[PDB]
Design a protein around this ligand. Structure first.
Ligand SMILES: C[C@H](O)[C@H](O)[C@H]1CNc2nc(N)[nH]c(=O)c2N1
Ligand SMILES: C[C@H](O)[C@H](O)[C@H]1CNc2nc(N)[nH]c(=O)c2N1
Ligand SMILES: [Fe+2]
Ligand SMILES: [Fe+2]
Lengths: 307, 307
């Protein structure tokens, strides 16, 4: 059986397992020729490397150019949320504005966002340096821990990122982790992953893609976006609720084996009935994963109980 | 409906509701004529008065005479536990000895015991100045908070206390709060109390008396003590497992209305089948309490959810 963390502190083992040679080193990266950007990225990676569970997340003074990039992303995306984002997103965003400094001229600090999420659902952030394996990223969700980047995309191309950056994390993921039913749903994916064979981690990563990252959900008689990749993409958030993509009901024996690519708009989205329904579906799928035990998280002790 | 705390921080309201004119002021108190003892008691009460949720519990340097009193109580009671205390007690006591400084020559600090309990079951301590109402004392249990005294009995009469003192709390109550099933059971009594009418608070206080304070439980084919009042009473711990008292099965419609006194050994004890069984019984009794809502604790946010 693959090793998995059984205490929230054991997530510390993960930061000595990331891809060390990241996207920012690639010749096509928007910031590739900028050595100040390169250094800035190394500074944020070193904050993640030195972070340990339990500590406050170090605050960073963002430069004026970084705040300008954030503001461009923030104001262009904000124009779509009332009409395209799910209720849960629109419910919490004004409180993020009021209590976490989500404004066009201010990049929120992760410590503040983490404390906010803890009061909402017990979710917390951990700064992360770069790409984790699907196994380690999903395993943090079992603890309601979201590994979160702190760097921003290069300012030459504010509407484009080849990777998660802080705009994606804060505008795409954080608002949904403030909702109890979503937190429970995402955590269920994390619990399904613990000790799962690699074959099933890839199926859970695909379910994650079509839910947490690119999901649509029913809302009364309508359909809204809740996937973080959609909520942080001006173009795709508009497209996803247009007549152009194909929509199918979330059905995990189909969804888990569906192919996708990351470099164009999705041709196909899966629609969740609700986060509670999606959670029950994940729980049923998880029972099919060969694991010689069951798992449960105990929030009182922050440990995984293995039966 | 009576007010009740809905967040763990709101337990702070309770310390401006204790009986201000305590047992130590009574002419029959073992320490009544000792003005140094009187001052020492006021010093511990002031620590409780100034305590707020979330803070470390102040450490106190105990005097040599206080440590001697503790040691007398500790060594005389310890002689009975292997044979008379329930398994759960005997399982955890050596870890209290090793990790919390439970020794004949050392009075454990409440901060250390609280951190220990949090790692076991999420239970925590709060220092308390004196007698709370049954409503406020039980309500803290809904949050897995045990209001705990920090003072010790007067040294003239080490085997006797007319009140909870630190020997009772640490040797009688703390070891059982380290057990998950007991923690769940005690918390269920706390949840039943929230917003309950006074009439039902008195019935829950009586159930508490016959369980948490003076309970016996089945253990395989035997019977053992788990009540804190028994585990901290050299004489009654021996008596309770002798042929002299009457024993009846725990049955809450009978137990909740049974009379008792605090000034002699109990003539009658109720025997729990198990802490999980006792918990289910409390849950069923709680459904009978007139309350226009149901309650649940969310350990992720440390709030009570009211439906
Ligand atoms: C679970 C699925 O692989 C998903 O794409 C994961 C992979 N690793 C990641 N690593 C980081 N740091 N951030 C993420 O959002 C993810 N996503
Ligand atoms: C619930 C029942 O009234 C029980 O005797 C309560 C009353 N108030 C108390 N107050 C304090 N501080 N300590 C306790 O153990 C209790 N016990
Ligand atoms: Fe993402
Ligand atoms: Fe007691």
């Amino acid at each position: 059986v693959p090793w998995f963390p059984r205490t929230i502190q054991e997530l510390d083992r993960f930061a000595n397992q990331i891809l060390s040679y990241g996207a920012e080193l690639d010749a096509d990266h928007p910031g590739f020729k900028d050595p100040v950007y390169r250094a800035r990225r190394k500074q944020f990676a070193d904050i993640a490397y030195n972070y340990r569970h339990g500590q406050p997340i170090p605050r960073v003074e963002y430069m004026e150019e970084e705040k300008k990039t954030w503001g461009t992303v923030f104001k262009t995306l904000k124009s779509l949320y009332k009409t395209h984002a799910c209720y849960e997103y629109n419910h919490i965003f004004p409180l993020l504005e009021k209590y976490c400094g989500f404004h066009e001229d201010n990049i929120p600090q992760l410590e503040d966002v983490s404390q906010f999420l803890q009061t909402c659902t017990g979710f917390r952030l951990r700064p992360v340096a770069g790409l984790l394996s699907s196994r380690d990223f999903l395993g943090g969700l079992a603890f309601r821990v979201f590994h979160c980047t702190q760097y921003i995309r290069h300012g030459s191309k504010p509407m484009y990122t080849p990777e998660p950056d802080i705009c994606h994390e804060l505008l795409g993921h954080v608002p949904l982790f403030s909702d109890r039913s979503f937190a429970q749903f995402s955590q269920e994916i994390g619990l399904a992953s613990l000790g799962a064979p690699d074959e099933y981690i890839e199926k859970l990563a695909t379910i994650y893609w079509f839910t947490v990252e690119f999901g649509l959900c029913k809302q009364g008689d309508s359909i809204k976006a809740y996937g973080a990749g959609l909520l942080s993409s001006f173009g795709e958030l508009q497209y996803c609720l247009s007549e152009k993509p194909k929509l199918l009901p979330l059905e995990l024996e189909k969804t888990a084996i569906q192919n996708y690519t990351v470099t164009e708009f999705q041709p196909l989205y899966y629609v969740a009935e609700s986060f509670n329904d999606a959670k029950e579906k994940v729980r049923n799928f998880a029972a099919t994963i060969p694991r010689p035990f069951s798992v449960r998280y105990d929030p009182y002790t922050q440990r995984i109980e293995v039966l």
